[PDB]
Design an enzyme around this catalytic site. Structure first.
Site, PDB file in Angstrom:
ATOM      1  N   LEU A  18       0.831  -1.199   0.000  1.00  0.00           N
ATOM      2  CA  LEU A  18       0.000   0.000   0.000  1.00  0.00           C
ATOM      3  C   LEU A  18       0.869   1.254   0.000  1.00  0.00           C
ATOM      4  O   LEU A  18       0.557   2.225  -0.683  1.00  0.00           O
ATOM      5  CB  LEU A  18      -0.902   0.027   1.230  1.00  0.00           C
ATOM      6  CG  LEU A  18      -2.347  -0.437   1.074  1.00  0.00           C
ATOM      7  CD1 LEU A  18      -3.099   0.045   2.291  1.00  0.00           C
ATOM      8  CD2 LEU A  18      -3.019   0.037  -0.203  1.00  0.00           C
ATOM      9  N   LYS A  45       1.685  -3.956   8.924  1.00  0.00           N
ATOM     10  CA  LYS A  45       2.799  -3.035   9.038  1.00  0.00           C
ATOM     11  C   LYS A  45       4.050  -3.787   9.474  1.00  0.00           C
ATOM     12  O   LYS A  45       3.973  -4.652  10.351  1.00  0.00           O
ATOM     13  CB  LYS A  45       2.502  -1.929  10.059  1.00  0.00           C
ATOM     14  CG  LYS A  45       3.679  -1.026  10.310  1.00  0.00           C
ATOM     15  CD  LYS A  45       3.359   0.334  10.920  1.00  0.00           C
ATOM     16  CE  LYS A  45       3.190   0.379  12.386  1.00  0.00           C
ATOM     17  NZ  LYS A  45       3.366   1.767  12.871  1.00  0.00           N
ATOM     18  N   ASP A 134       3.491  11.414  19.035  1.00  0.00           N
ATOM     19  CA  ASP A 134       3.556  11.586  17.593  1.00  0.00           C
ATOM     20  C   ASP A 134       2.191  11.872  16.975  1.00  0.00           C
ATOM     21  O   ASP A 134       1.886  11.376  15.891  1.00  0.00           O
ATOM     22  CB  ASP A 134       4.221  10.392  16.933  1.00  0.00           C
ATOM     23  CG  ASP A 134       4.708  10.670  15.516  1.00  0.00           C
ATOM     24  OD1 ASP A 134       4.717  11.855  15.102  1.00  0.00           O
ATOM     25  OD2 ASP A 134       5.006   9.697  14.810  1.00  0.00           O
ATOM     26  N   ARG A 138      -0.949  12.946   9.731  1.00  0.00           N
ATOM     27  CA  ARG A 138      -0.431  11.759   9.056  1.00  0.00           C
ATOM     28  C   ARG A 138      -0.703  10.480   9.852  1.00  0.00           C
ATOM     29  O   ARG A 138      -0.639   9.384   9.295  1.00  0.00           O
ATOM     30  CB  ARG A 138       1.080  11.857   8.811  1.00  0.00           C
ATOM     31  CG  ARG A 138       1.908  12.021  10.080  1.00  0.00           C
ATOM     32  CD  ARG A 138       3.418  12.067   9.784  1.00  0.00           C
ATOM     33  NE  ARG A 138       4.141  12.339  11.028  1.00  0.00           N
ATOM     34  CZ  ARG A 138       4.303  13.541  11.590  1.00  0.00           C
ATOM     35  NH1 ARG A 138       3.984  14.624  10.937  1.00  0.00           N
ATOM     36  NH2 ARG A 138       4.847  13.650  12.778  1.00  0.00           N
ATOM     37  N   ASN A 139      -0.962  10.611  11.157  1.00  0.00           N
ATOM     38  CA  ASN A 139      -1.151   9.467  12.037  1.00  0.00           C
ATOM     39  C   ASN A 139      -2.584   9.398  12.574  1.00  0.00           C
ATOM     40  O   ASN A 139      -2.827   8.808  13.620  1.00  0.00           O
ATOM     41  CB  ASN A 139      -0.163   9.524  13.196  1.00  0.00           C
ATOM     42  CG  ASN A 139       1.266   9.294  12.756  1.00  0.00           C
ATOM     43  OD1 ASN A 139       1.526   8.622  11.749  1.00  0.00           O
ATOM     44  ND2 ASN A 139       2.211   9.828  13.512  1.00  0.00           N
ATOM     45  N   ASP A 152      -0.211   4.775  14.949  1.00  0.00           N
ATOM     46  CA  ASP A 152       1.240   4.876  15.074  1.00  0.00           C
ATOM     47  C   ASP A 152       1.689   5.084  16.515  1.00  0.00           C
ATOM     48  O   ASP A 152       1.851   6.219  16.968  1.00  0.00           O
ATOM     49  CB  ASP A 152       1.864   5.909  14.154  1.00  0.00           C
ATOM     50  CG  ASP A 152       3.325   5.604  13.877  1.00  0.00           C
ATOM     51  OD1 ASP A 152       3.991   5.151  14.825  1.00  0.00           O
ATOM     52  OD2 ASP A 152       3.772   5.810  12.724  1.00  0.00           O
TER      53      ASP A 152
HETATM   54  C1  LIG Z   1      -0.903   8.816   5.464  1.00  0.00           C
HETATM   55  C2  LIG Z   1      -1.374   7.830   4.404  1.00  0.00           C
HETATM   56  C3  LIG Z   1      -1.123   6.360   4.735  1.00  0.00           C
HETATM   57  O1  LIG Z   1      -0.902   5.934   5.864  1.00  0.00           O
HETATM   58  N1  LIG Z   1      -1.182   5.479   3.709  1.00  0.00           N
HETATM   59  C4  LIG Z   1      -1.396   5.819   2.279  1.00  0.00           C
HETATM   60  C5  LIG Z   1      -1.725   4.496   1.545  1.00  0.00           C
HETATM   61  C6  LIG Z   1      -1.139   3.390   2.453  1.00  0.00           C
HETATM   62  C7  LIG Z   1      -0.961   4.045   3.832  1.00  0.00           C
HETATM   63  C8  LIG Z   1       0.466   3.783   4.258  1.00  0.00           C
HETATM   64  C9  LIG Z   1      -1.838   3.397   4.828  1.00  0.00           C
HETATM   65  C10 LIG Z   1      -2.477   2.858   5.641  1.00  0.00           C
HETATM   66  C11 LIG Z   1      -3.245   2.214   6.683  1.00  0.00           C
HETATM   67  C12 LIG Z   1      -4.455   1.632   6.351  1.00  0.00           C
HETATM   68  N2  LIG Z   1      -5.186   0.989   7.245  1.00  0.00           N
HETATM   69  C13 LIG Z   1      -4.832   0.888   8.498  1.00  0.00           C
HETATM   70  C14 LIG Z   1      -3.663   1.435   8.945  1.00  0.00           C
HETATM   71  C15 LIG Z   1      -2.819   2.119   8.049  1.00  0.00           C
HETATM   72  C16 LIG Z   1      -1.623   2.778   8.583  1.00  0.00           C
HETATM   73  N3  LIG Z   1      -1.003   3.820   7.951  1.00  0.00           N
HETATM   74  C17 LIG Z   1      -0.011   4.321   8.682  1.00  0.00           C
HETATM   75  C18 LIG Z   1      -0.002   3.692   9.911  1.00  0.00           C
HETATM   76  C19 LIG Z   1      -1.051   2.680   9.864  1.00  0.00           C
HETATM   77  N4  LIG Z   1      -1.354   1.833  10.935  1.00  0.00           N
HETATM   78  C20 LIG Z   1      -1.154   0.443  10.971  1.00  0.00           C
HETATM   79  C21 LIG Z   1      -0.996  -0.330   9.823  1.00  0.00           C
HETATM   80  C22 LIG Z   1      -0.878  -1.716   9.917  1.00  0.00           C
HETATM   81  C23 LIG Z   1      -0.928  -2.322  11.148  1.00  0.00           C
HETATM   82  C24 LIG Z   1      -1.090  -1.574  12.280  1.00  0.00           C
HETATM   83 CL1  LIG Z   1      -1.204  -2.306  13.838  1.00  0.00          CL
HETATM   84  C25 LIG Z   1      -1.254  -0.188  12.203  1.00  0.00           C
HETATM   85  O2  LIG Z   1      -1.432   0.551  13.358  1.00  0.00           O
HETATM   86  C26 LIG Z   1      -0.214   0.958  13.967  1.00  0.00           C
HETATM   87  C27 LIG Z   1       1.020   4.032  10.911  1.00  0.00           C
HETATM   88  O3  LIG Z   1       1.260   3.307  11.863  1.00  0.00           O
HETATM   89  N5  LIG Z   1       1.753   5.163  10.682  1.00  0.00           N
HETATM   90  C28 LIG Z   1       1.470   6.093   9.605  1.00  0.00           C
HETATM   91  C29 LIG Z   1       0.944   5.434   8.330  1.00  0.00           C
HETATM   92  C30 LIG Z   1       0.122   9.929   5.145  1.00  0.00           C
HETATM   93  N6  LIG Z   1       1.489   9.401   5.234  1.00  0.00           N
HETATM   94  C31 LIG Z   1       1.689   8.720   6.565  1.00  0.00           C
HETATM   95  C32 LIG Z   1       2.444  10.497   5.099  1.00  0.00           C
HETATM   96 CL    CL Z   2       5.953   3.189  13.986  1.00  0.00          CL
END
Ligand code: A1A4E
Ligand code: CL
Ligand code: CL
Ligand code: CL
Ligand code: CL
Length: 308
Positions: A18, A45, A134, A138-139, A152
């Site tokens: 993604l 993630k 944080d 974005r979060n 996050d």
């Molecule tokens: C934010 C956009 C962004 O985060 N995007 C753009 C397309 C993919 C992406 C990376 C996404 C997503 C997403 C979707 N569903 C659930 C969670 C997330 C996620 N995105 C971020 C975090 C996410 N959290 C996650 C993901 C997977 C598993 C877990 Cl447990 C979890 O929770 C921690 C994250 O942790 N940090 C930030 C991105 C703009 N850009 C961040 C600049």
């Molecule tokens: Cl992280």
């Protein structure tokens, strides 16, 4: 009592990248738990370390509960070539991207509701002694346009029973979202999260402007010490901007509490056009789950840090 459910690699189908960035790599997939025909859209993630991501899992599992609408929930972890965290897919992505991409249909009621929800999520974390460290647009993730969740937990810290502050070491941190005392003294509290909340609100009300754009992170403490702050967004009436300014007070204990922010933004959300001035507001619409055709939107969608 923090538990981690281990999910078998074989229970995940259709895994696809993604995005990647500071937060690592995130994939989407379908989780089919064995003994069910239910297919659950998930985000996955990993970092880029195994230990770092387990610290995040620990925090997330620690703060989860039955009634947890505005903080991401860990579904479990997967052990593959990497340690991965698993959560419910947030199909509309992050709020920073969302506000940049849907500016022309984001009305006053949506912006204020998001402010309420983020404040509710933060109050929930504060009640559990968690300093996020944080909070940023974005979060914050978008489950539906009407429903957001904080994510996050990479920097988040749990305070001990007698502790009011966390003192950091020399890791990379988001200077432009940080309270002055965090920049100068590496001190983090619930009230430093309130500063970050004010910056987050500013990001939303500017439809995703970059804070202090073109200003080096090294100059921020001096700007703050001179009394300079982020500017008033054009849609914001004075009462909304004054909330932000209170979040960025030098004296941490003078800043609003999340409990108070819930109440104030709730009051504004009861008369949204009084508090935000957006051209064409009444004519704007975003997809909602009460819509007959919301499922359409879903299928279509599902388909910062510097060394101190
Ligand atoms: C934010 C956009 C962004 O985060 N995007 C753009 C397309 C993919 C992406 C990376 C996404 C997503 C997403 C979707 N569903 C659930 C969670 C997330 C996620 N995105 C971020 C975090 C996410 N959290 C996650 C993901 C997977 C598993 C877990 Cl447990 C979890 O929770 C921690 C994250 O942790 N940090 C930030 C991105 C703009 N850009 C961040 C600049
Ligand atoms: Cl992280
Ligand atoms: Cl709401
Ligand atoms: Cl001040
Ligand atoms: Cl920054």
């Amino acid at each position: 009592q923090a538990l981690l459910r281990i999910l078998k690699e074989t229970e995940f189908k259709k895994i696809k990248v993604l995005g990647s960035g500071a937060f690592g790599t995130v994939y989407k997939g379908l989780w089919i738990p064995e003994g069910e025909k239910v297919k659950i859209p998930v985000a996955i993630k990993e970092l880029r370390a195994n230990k770092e991501i387990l610290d995040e899992a620990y925090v997330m599992a620690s703060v989860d509960s039955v009634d947890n609408p505005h903080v991401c929930r860990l579904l479990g972890i997967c052990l593959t070539s990497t340690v991965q965290l698993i959560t419910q897919l947030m199909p509309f992505g992050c709020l920073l991207d969302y506000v940049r991409e849907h500016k022309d249909n984001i009305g006053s009621q949506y912006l204020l509701n998001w402010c309420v929800q983020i404040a509710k999520g933060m109050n929930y974390l504060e009640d559990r002694r968690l300093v996020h460290r944080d909070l940023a647009a974005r979060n914050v993730l978008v489950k539906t346009p009407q429903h957001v969740k904080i994510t996050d937990f990479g920097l988040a810290k749990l305070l001990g029973a007698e502790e009011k502050e966390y003192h950091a070491e020399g890791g990379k941190v988001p200077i432009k979202w940080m309270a002055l005392e965090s920049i100068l003294h590496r001190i983090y509290t619930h009230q430093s999260d309130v500063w970050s909340y004010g910056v987050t609100v500013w990001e939303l009300m500017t439809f995703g402007s970059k804070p202090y754009d073109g200003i080096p992170a090294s100059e921020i403490s001096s700007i703050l010490e001179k009394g300079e702050r982020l500017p008033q967004p054009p849609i914001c009436t004075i009462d909304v901007y004054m909330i932000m300014r209170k979040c960025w007070m030098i004296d941490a204990d003078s800043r609003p509490k999340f409990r108070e922010l819930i109440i104030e933004f709730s009051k504004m959300a009861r008369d949204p056009q009084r508090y935000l001035v957006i051209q064409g507001d009444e004519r704007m619409h975003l997809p909602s789950p009460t819509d007959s055709n919301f499922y359409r939107a879903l299928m279509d969608e599902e388909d910062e840090y510097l060394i101190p």
